[PDB]
Scaffold this active site. Structure first.
Site, PDB file in Angstrom:
ATOM      1  N   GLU A   1       0.829  -1.207   0.000  1.00  0.00           N
ATOM      2  CA  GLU A   1       0.000   0.000   0.000  1.00  0.00           C
ATOM      3  C   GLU A   1       0.857   1.248   0.000  1.00  0.00           C
ATOM      4  O   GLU A   1       1.733   1.428   0.864  1.00  0.00           O
ATOM      5  CB  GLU A   1      -0.941   0.017   1.224  1.00  0.00           C
ATOM      6  CG  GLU A   1      -1.932  -1.140   1.179  1.00  0.00           C
ATOM      7  CD  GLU A   1      -2.837  -1.161  -0.042  1.00  0.00           C
ATOM      8  OE1 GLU A   1      -2.939  -0.133  -0.776  1.00  0.00           O
ATOM      9  OE2 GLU A   1      -3.422  -2.261  -0.296  1.00  0.00           O
TER      10      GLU A   1
ATOM     11  N   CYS B   1      -7.824  -2.363   7.605  1.00  0.00           N
ATOM     12  CA  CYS B   1      -6.417  -2.360   7.187  1.00  0.00           C
ATOM     13  C   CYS B   1      -5.931  -0.946   6.897  1.00  0.00           C
ATOM     14  O   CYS B   1      -4.872  -0.531   7.361  1.00  0.00           O
ATOM     15  CB  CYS B   1      -6.227  -3.230   5.937  1.00  0.00           C
ATOM     16  SG  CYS B   1      -6.494  -5.022   6.297  1.00  0.00           S
TER      17      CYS B   1
ATOM     18  N   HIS C   1      -0.925  -6.231   1.643  1.00  0.00           N
ATOM     19  CA  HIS C   1      -2.175  -6.974   1.459  1.00  0.00           C
ATOM     20  C   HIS C   1      -1.878  -8.277   0.737  1.00  0.00           C
ATOM     21  O   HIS C   1      -1.119  -8.294  -0.236  1.00  0.00           O
ATOM     22  CB  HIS C   1      -3.167  -6.153   0.630  1.00  0.00           C
ATOM     23  CG  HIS C   1      -4.223  -5.440   1.436  1.00  0.00           C
ATOM     24  ND1 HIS C   1      -4.443  -4.078   1.343  1.00  0.00           N
ATOM     25  CD2 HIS C   1      -5.123  -5.911   2.335  1.00  0.00           C
ATOM     26  CE1 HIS C   1      -5.450  -3.749   2.140  1.00  0.00           C
ATOM     27  NE2 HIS C   1      -5.884  -4.840   2.751  1.00  0.00           N
TER      28      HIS C   1
END
Ligand SMILES: O=C1CC[C@@H](C(=O)O)N1
Ligand SMILES: O=C1CC[C@@H](C(=O)O)N1
Ligand SMILES: O=C1CC[C@@H](C(=O)O)N1
Ligand SMILES: O=C1CC[C@@H](C(=O)O)N1
Ligand code: NA
Ligand code: NA
Ligand code: NA
Ligand code: NA
EC number: 3.4.19.3
Lengths: 213, 212, 213, 212
Positions: free
Chosen positions: C83, C146, C171
């Protein structure tokens, strides 16, 4: 019936869908006069194979059509598609509108595994492209009720000496009503406004009857 | 000018796309009169961040808009979407129209990592639904030129004391022309007829000015 | 704590998923010794933002880690992803494990709209490629739990003078257990065997600590 | 030979793929002894229908198998799948490895429109599930070379009085090598490590011979 008839069918809503764009298109195009003396005769079929087959047999027998365009919803597909093949198996991932399911079930004892559609597939794709409509051939219609009626119609026509009658299936995307009903926990559907879907069905109908000359 | 202006932008064609539905929508809606004395002013941005930023700064300064609706193509998306956030990075998966790419490049040194869009997002979604238009909020605009201009406009407005001017981004699906140009070896695109795309942009513009 | 610690977290099962591959990977890698004197300290977080934030703050404070690798399930993604950005908004498409939802909710009054992850993103991608693991950077972590912990950790580190501590989110796809539980009415999930997922997390951990030198 | 043989085939790399997981799985499993005296005989087919048909006919004749498991790559699919039906048409969206394409071409004049696969499909699905392998039945194999060899083998067996020999097709996802070669401008592929793919092929082979 004197002048040539194109038989156009759509299906009722089913599953969680509140509308069926194939029903809307069949309803709007009923009675359309096409060149060469052709006229569209529309009918709606139930999403249940026994009743849909009985209704479709009656239409094929009573209307004696010169061409057959069966249509239905393919929620999730982005563009109109023409089915190449109807397979002689019923295998339902969701129940039909009677709550019924079938697993690996042959449609007809002692009949072919499949029938190829006899519509002029490439002529329809070309007519769609000329009308600025994206589309393509699909090589599986699923094994639910749309596939069932495609196989059913091709088999009936062949068994009745009418295998030369062009016959096939046109799957359409969701319209707005179908896409708006999708739950927030699910992925969004590709969709088309109903007027685009109806126009795609109309353009296919016009190409089919133009070729029968 | 003296009356409130909604600034509406679209982008030129880029990559292998022969048309850009955001360009078509901006062109059709230029000059639209909206209730409350609002009018739409349209402009067409190039798909290249230096020239797009310069053009957008000139528009923000000279047109002095009361609201800003930036639009662009998101080929592959099935429904119109509203971008929640513009991120301060340029990272290009395909070249821009100058043939340039950027890798992990901050847009401006010493500026925020992101800006949240300040359009009335839920009011626009509700207006779309009332007009029978499926749509949703997107939480990434990509890091290509559409994201760049979203970040650029939100930063410019805040730096000029105009953070209260509602400003955001509306990504649209392919139209028929975009979908028809996809090669045979590639997956088909979701698309909408241009008239559906233009109507969605119009409904969003009307909801934005109704809220202001 | 004398030697440098990489803090590795995963999440519990949530929604209709019977397993969480991020929990499995964190469990398997706890205590792993990495070169340079680094050791992995793992913890599991609940899928509920208030408790996950409180637990994560305690871990950051008590472990004083030299690097932070937060992991979680992204059911539907085909490949491991890193991310780029944590956004300061809570917007839940499904309830969390307390049945709770948030709509357009800022995480922290008077704080940045977002934090960029401070992991060495390109070095991790390169280590994955050398290990024959496909992967990429993601530019949205969603706005569920998350994303919440990614923003929470980056904010805490910055506010505590520890903004130089590399911190980010990884992820992972469904594992087999997650993919096997999908109902027959839903599309199949991309998945990876758990051993591939754990190896991807391990390779990322090794690249992060190698760079901190 | 004197003992029952499961014929297992895979395909060479094709298109932009540098590896073919079906080739790797067939190579690893050649000679596997299965219960009941069964053994696996593997072969690697070219991605070109004339040569593939000729090679497959030779295998069916010379190896005289009691079961036939044809395998191939389905890049983009997330899970192993079993093909229900082979259709008697060649229609290629990309060229084969001879650079050739076919448009709406019947495989054999005066032959059936399709053949249903005769593998024990539900028993294989159940064996996969017991082995914690997600998988399903597919109702189109495409109309490229994998479909061609499925139709070819089912037709050959029926024409030689061997329609009772279980015969079908197993499409596999990309492995890591296939996924790693995808260009940056294209969507990422679902994939499985090769060891997962090979295990799925092995579990299917074991279920087929257990049923026979
Ligand atoms: O419109 C319809 C009715 C059944 C379903 C199908 O594709 O089989 N679509
Ligand atoms: O219309 C456009 C121009 C650039 C691209 C984007 O989403 O960044 N779409
Ligand atoms: O493992 C997890 C916990 C919450 C969810 C998410 O992506 O936010 N995935
Ligand atoms: O492994 C292969 C060879 C041809 C292609 C197919 O599905 O037809 N997959
Ligand atoms: Na004004
Ligand atoms: Na990149
Ligand atoms: Na034998
Ligand atoms: Na074709």
């Amino acid at each position: 019936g004197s002048m040539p008839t194109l038989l156009l069918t759509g299906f009722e809503p089913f599953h969680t869908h509140p509308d069926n764009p194939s029903a809307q298109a069949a309803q709007e195009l009923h009675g359309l006069e096409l060149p060469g003396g052709w006229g569209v005769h529309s009918a709606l079929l139930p999403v249940e194979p026994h009743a849909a087959g009985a209704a479709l047999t009656r239409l094929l027998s009573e209307q004696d059509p010169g061409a057959v365009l069966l249509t239905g919803l393919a929620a999730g597909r982005p563009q109109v598609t023409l089915e190449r093949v109807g397979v002689g198996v019923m295998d339902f991932q969701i129940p039909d509108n009677a709550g019924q399911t079938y697993r690996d079930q042959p449609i007809e004892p002692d009949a072919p595994a499949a029938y190829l559609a006899t519509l002029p597939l490439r002529a329809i794709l070309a007519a769609w492209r000329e009308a600025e409509i994206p589309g393509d051939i699909s090589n599986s219609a699923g094994l639910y009720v749309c596939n069932f009626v495609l196989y059913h119609a091709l088999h009936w026509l062949r068994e009745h000496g009418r295998g030369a009658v062009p016959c096939g299936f046109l799957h359409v995307p969701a319209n707005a009503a179908v896409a708006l009903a999708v739950p927030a926990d699910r992925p969004p559907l590709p969709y088309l406004p109903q007027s685009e879907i109806t126009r795609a069905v109309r353009v296919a109908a016009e190409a089919i009857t133009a070729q029968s000359s």
